[PDB]
Design a protein around this ligand. Structure first.
Ligand code: GNP
Ligand code: CA
Ligand code: CA
Ligand code: CA
Ligand code: CL
Ligand code: CL
Ligand code: CL
Ligand code: CO
Ligand code: CO
Ligand code: CO
Ligand code: MG
Lengths: 54, 166
């Protein structure tokens, strides 16, 4: 799957996400390869595949 | 009013995770040490009203500062924890508070001062120091022990009350 999040609009393949939690109606995640980073998306905007990794 | 986003912050080792786990599991889990922040939900009754605590137990060493900031913007209430045998943890409080205020761009954010480990046979932070500091912030101070559970419900419930009165 792809996770789309935002002060710019970015995207990351869910295969790169190493960590994810649900808090305060948002989904919080980290991603890495070898780009490395973090992002967050509302609970109602997150892909099924991401929710499944909770 | 039904859901409350609580953030737990404080220096490494003060008992952020121990306190959170005492609230959730109603006992002291020894050797519990998540390295990354984690969230916990609990249904509780506070002053009649049933409500959902959505609790973020922050990492000792948050890797992303902007991620720390976004957590703070999203949180409604903050448990600022120090340990009564660690003066450094207590001096940190001043900076947690004004960092939180800076980041949420607000002069009045719901907070509670927590001095954990009051089961310990020694003190380096005097009760007077913490009470004077809390009074200057106009917030509650609650001395706790995640080991004995002394003050634990009280610390989280009082934070909810600070939120209810905005
Ligand atoms: N005596 C006593 N020890 C405590 C108490 N709360 C936590 N500790 C101990 O102090 C240490 C730190 O606890 P911990 O819960 O990991 O603190 P933390 O603030 O979550 N650490 P980190 O920020 O690195 O996640 C552990 O050895 C724990 O057992 C308390 O109320 N009394
Ligand atoms: Ca970035
Ligand atoms: Ca130990
Ligand atoms: Ca206030
Ligand atoms: Cl130890
Ligand atoms: Cl600071
Ligand atoms: Cl005690
Ligand atoms: Co709320
Ligand atoms: Co148990
Ligand atoms: Co400062
Ligand atoms: Mg911890």
């Amino acid at each position: 799957a792809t996770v789309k999040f935002t002060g710019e609009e970015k995207q990351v393949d869910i295969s790169k996400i190493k960590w994810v939690i649900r808090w305060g109606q948002y989904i919080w995640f980290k991603y890495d390869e070898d780009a490395k980073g973090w992002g967050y998306v509302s609970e109602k905007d997150a892909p099924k595949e991401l929710l499944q990794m909770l | 009013m039904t859901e409350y986003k609580l953030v737990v912050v404080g220096a490494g080792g003060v008992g952020k995770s121990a306190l959170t786990i005492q609230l959730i599991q109603n006992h002291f889990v020894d050797e519990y040490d998540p390295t990354i922040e984690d969230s916990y939900r609990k249904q509780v009754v506070i002053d009649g009203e049933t409500c959902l605590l959505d609790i973020l137990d922050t990492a000792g060493q948050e890797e992303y500062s902007a991620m720390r900031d976004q957590y703070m913007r999203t949180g409604e209430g903050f448990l600022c924890v120090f340990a009564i045998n660690n003066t450094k943890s207590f001096e940190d409080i001043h900076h947690y508070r004004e960092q939180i205020k800076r980041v949420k761009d607000s002069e009045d954010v719901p907070m509670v001062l927590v001095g954990n480990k009051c089961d310990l046979p020694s003190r380096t932070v005097d009760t007077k120091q913490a009470q004077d500091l809390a009074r200057s912030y106009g917030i509650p101070f609650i001395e706790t022990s995640a080991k004995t559970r002394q003050g634990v419900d009280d610390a989280f419930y009082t934070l909810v009350r600070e939120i209810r009165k905005h």
